Amino acid sequence: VNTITFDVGNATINKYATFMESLRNEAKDPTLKCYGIPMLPDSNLTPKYVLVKLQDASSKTITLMLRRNNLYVMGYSDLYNGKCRYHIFNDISSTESTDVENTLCPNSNSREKKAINYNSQYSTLQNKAGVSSRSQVQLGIQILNSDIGKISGVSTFTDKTEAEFLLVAIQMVSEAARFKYIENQVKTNFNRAFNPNPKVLSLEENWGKISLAIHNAKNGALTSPLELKNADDTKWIVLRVDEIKPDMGLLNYVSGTCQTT
Ligand SMILES: Nc1ncnc2[nH]cnc12
């Protein structure tokens, strides 16, 4: 399994664009695509995972472990007192947990557990972060940089600190890779913090339905329209692939053939 590094401390728009491109190209199936949009692999393709190393301005890092089939963050590691400290979500199966241990921290004599004692659903992360909606957790490059430093090499931190980091990182890494729209929100706001708008949230929550709708579309027409939100919180009834393709970075894996095109 490969590691993609993003230097948050020295980030520029172009370096984030390159990061997104690299992450999409490592995660995607080598071949699968629908309507020109690359698709993630089935859950049997190896390697099953990708690592994403995030570097702060002090050169400390956190490495996220992502599942290729759905781009979920499974856990993260940091160097702590010389040790590979691995932090696994509590919703990972026994067999995948072994893989997380061994992928984040391959040397079994130099590693140390520090569990994430909660699941990785946004509802849970929001709860831990003290917010009723992740619209209330700002995203941004300086925020990500700061949050890495609250955790990496730090003996103890609160669940709120951890959940904030995870909400920021999940959205700026996995959601941005899945959605060019979200990558572009980061780029448009590159020099500042921002709050995810209703379209960011609607895309995040509907990626599986969107991916299925694109995979199933015939001659560019969705079989069933899909109702999303625009950035101004008005309904967006998507009728055609060409309406939503610009916002897409990766499709969730969907079995069967599609117009590739
Ligand atoms: N752990 C995770 N990783 C990626 N996307 C997510 N969406 C919700 N939780 C997530």
Curated annotation (Swiss-Prot):
<dbReference type="Pfam" id="PF00161">
    <property type="entry name" value="RIP"/>
</dbReference>
<dbReference type="InterPro" id="IPR017988">
    <property type="entry name" value="Ribosome_inactivat_prot_CS"/>
</dbReference>
<dbReference type="InterPro" id="IPR017989">
    <property type="entry name" value="Ribosome_inactivat_1/2"/>
</dbReference>
<keyword id="KW-0652">Protein synthesis inhibitor</keyword>
<comment type="similarity">
    <text>Belongs to the ribosome-inactivating protein family. Type 1 RIP subfamily.</text>
</comment>
<feature type="active site">
    <location>
        <position position="175"/>
    </location>
</feature>
<feature type="disulfide bond">
    <location>
        <begin position="84"/>
        <end position="105"/>
    </location>
</feature>
<dbReference type="GO" id="GO:0030598">
    <property type="term" value="F:rRNA N-glycosylase activity"/>
</dbReference>
<dbReference type="InterPro" id="IPR001574">
    <property type="entry name" value="Ribosome_inactivat_prot"/>
</dbReference>
<keyword id="KW-0611">Plant defense</keyword>
<dbReference type="InterPro" id="IPR016139">
    <property type="entry name" value="Ribosome_inactivat_prot_sub2"/>
</dbReference>
<dbReference type="GO" id="GO:0017148">
    <property type="term" value="P:negative regulation of translation"/>
</dbReference>
<feature type="disulfide bond">
    <location>
        <begin position="34"/>
        <end position="258"/>
    </location>
</feature>
<dbReference type="GO" id="GO:0006952">
    <property type="term" value="P:defense response"/>
</dbReference>
<keyword id="KW-0378">Hydrolase</keyword>
<feature type="glycosylation site" description="N-linked (GlcNAc...) asparagine; in PD-L3">
    <location>
        <position position="10"/>
    </location>
</feature>
<keyword id="KW-1015">Disulfide bond</keyword>
<dbReference type="InterPro" id="IPR036041">
    <property type="entry name" value="Ribosome-inact_prot_sf"/>
</dbReference>
<protein>
    <recommendedName>
        <fullName>Ribosome-inactivating protein PD-L3/PD-L4</fullName>
        <ecNumber>3.2.2.22</ecNumber>
    </recommendedName>
</protein>
<keyword id="KW-0325">Glycoprotein</keyword>
<dbReference type="InterPro" id="IPR016138">
    <property type="entry name" value="Ribosome_inactivat_prot_sub1"/>
</dbReference>
<dbReference type="GO" id="GO:0090729">
    <property type="term" value="F:toxin activity"/>
</dbReference>
<comment type="function">
    <text>Inhibits protein synthesis. Does not cleave supercoiled pBR322 dsDNA.</text>
</comment>
<keyword id="KW-0800">Toxin</keyword>
